[PDB]
């Protein structure tokens, strides 16, 4: 049986990414690093 409403449940994959970048401001450098890592166009919800 193919699972439905999968996105409403707990995440089931983890991906390790990393990157770096220069920037005109700290936030622009941060943004550049995320872009360099491949996750620059999604919203990061920091888990602690």
């Amino acid at each position: 049986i193919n699972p439905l409403h999968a996105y409403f449940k707990l995440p089931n994959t983890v991906s390790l990414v990393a990157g770096s970048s220069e920037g005109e401001t700290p936030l622009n450098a941060f943004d550049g690093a995320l872009l360099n890592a491949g996750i620059g166009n999604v919203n990061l919800i920091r888990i602690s």
Binding site: L10, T13, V14, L16, S20, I39, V42
Partner: protein, 113 residues
């Protein structure tokens, strides 16, 4: 962080732009020319598949090598504190030599199959 039980480490999937991605990350920003900054991320995977994985992050004014060595040990220590048997630790790191203003970043993004 925490990798849910039975979750798998996979290459970054094609993420929908704007997605609210639960992410554990470490970063460091520096405006000192010639300074080397690094960030690293690790995930300790348990032998017992019913248990969860532990994600650790690290950042600092050091080399890529030192950052990875450090973050891997941090994940191992987390498993030691829990008394959990280790399958393996996966990690990645990045270093950046500041020209004017730079940022080093490492993360573990949780998503769906």
């Amino acid at each position: 962080x925490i990798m849910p039980p039975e979750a798998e480490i996979v290459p970054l999937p094609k993420l929908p732009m704007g997605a609210l991605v639960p992410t554990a990350y470490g970063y460091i920003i520096s405006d000192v020319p010639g300074e080397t900054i690094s960030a690293a991320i690790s995930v300790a995977i348990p032998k017992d598949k019913s248990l969860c994985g532990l994600i650790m992050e690290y950042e600092g004014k050091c080399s890529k090598k030192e950052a990875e060595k450090t973050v891997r040990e941090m994940a191992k220590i987390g498993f030691e504190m829990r008394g959990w048997e280790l399958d393996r630790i996966e990690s990645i790191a990045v270093e950046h030599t500041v020209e004017k203003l730079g940022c080093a970043f490492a993360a573990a993004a949780l998503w769906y199959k």
